[PDB]
Amino acid sequence: YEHVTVIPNTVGVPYKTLVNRPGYSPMVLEMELLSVTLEPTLSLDYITC
Amino acid sequence: VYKATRPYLAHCPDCGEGHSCHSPVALERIRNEATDGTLKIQVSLQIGIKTDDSHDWTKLRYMDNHMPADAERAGLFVRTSAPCTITGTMGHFILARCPKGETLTVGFTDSRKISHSCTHPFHHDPPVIGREKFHSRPQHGKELPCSTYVQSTAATTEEIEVHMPPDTPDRTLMSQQSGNVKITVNGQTVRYKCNCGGSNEGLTTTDKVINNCKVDQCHAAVTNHKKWQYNSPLVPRNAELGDRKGKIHIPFPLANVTCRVPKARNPTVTYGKNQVIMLLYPDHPTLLSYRNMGEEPNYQEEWVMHKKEVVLTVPTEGLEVTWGNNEPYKYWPQ
C-alpha cells in the first residue's frame, strides 16, 4: 500500500503520519528529517594564499 | 604460485559426441572484451607447469583421476568451426585467434595417447576494427585504438579467487562385510558419511567398519587437505570451511593498445544560389554528415550505400560537409 504525505523541509522535527489502508487497522509512522544533501558540481578555477 | 594450486576435474556438457563428463580440460569462462578479436579462455588444466611445479613451456599438467599428470603442449588445441591460432598459454589460461563459430572446443592428448576435449556453445563473430573487413594484419596502416590480452606471461593486475580443493567420490572404498559397511582406505585419507548411528562421520587415515549399516546408505571420497583450486562453480564448495578464500594474479590482462588499418575519395560538385549539389559514388557504406556554421547547426547524417545525388542548402554563415573518412568540406555563398 502506497502512503503519500508532505512534511516541511525542517530538520529535528518529528512528524506523525496516519496510514489508513481500507480494511486494515490504522498505522502511525513517526518521520524525522534524515539529512538531505545538495552537492553542486565543482570546477576549480584557481587557489589563493 | 603453482606450488599451492593444482589442475582439476570439472563438469563439461560436451566431452565429444554430445555426452557430458568429468573433464580434465573443462571450460570455465571465455572472455571476449578485446576489440582486436583475441579470446581469453580459462580451463581446468594448467599449461606450462609440470607435476613437480617447475615451469616448462613444452609441458602441460592435468588431473588424471586422483593425481595430476604431465602432457605435451604440442597436443593442446583450440577450435570453433575450424582450428584456432593459439597466441599464448600459461596456467589455466589460453589466448586464441578464432574464425567465426557457434561453439568453442579446447582439447589435448594425454600420456596414454587418449584425446580429451570440452565443447561449450559460444557465439564467436568478432566486430570489425575500423571501416574495412580485412583478413591479415598489415605492417603499415592507420593507427586505431583497440584492446588486447597482452602475451606477457607476468601476472600483476588481473586476479582469480582460489580455495581448498574438493574430494573424489569412490564407491569401491566401501564393501559389504556380511551385513555391515567396510571402508578400506588403502594408504589414503578418506572422508566418509553414513545414514546410520554412532561414528558415521570422519576424516580417516585408517580402515573403518560401520555395523548394522548398508553399503547404499554410505558416501565415501578420497581427499587431500593440502592445496588450492580455482573457485569453480563446476566443483562443490568445501563443506567443513565457510567462506574461506584466497586470491592469485593471472597472466594475459586486458590492455589498451594500437591496431594497424586504412582510408578514402571526392564527389563531383556543382553549385547553385545558396545550394550545393554532390554526386556521391561510394564503393562501400559511407557516412555523410552536414551542419550549418551558425547558431542553428541542424546536424544531419545518413549512410550512403550506392549512387545518390544530394542537394544541400548553403546558408550565409556557411555549411560544413563530412564525406566518410575525408577532412570536412566547407561551403559559403558568394
Place this chain on the structure above:
Amino acid sequence: ENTQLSEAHVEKSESCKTEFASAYRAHTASASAKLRVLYQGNNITVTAY
C-alpha cells in the same frame, strides 16, 4: 535430504579501467581566448579569455 545452495552476484569487468564512459554534470563554462595578428611585418599570437 541433500541440498545445493546456488549463489551469484554482479561486478565491474577487468576492462573497466581501459574501456569506460564517464557521466558528468556540466555547468557555467569559463570562456578563454587567443589569435594571429600581423603586427609590424611579424606574426604575433594572442591567447586570451
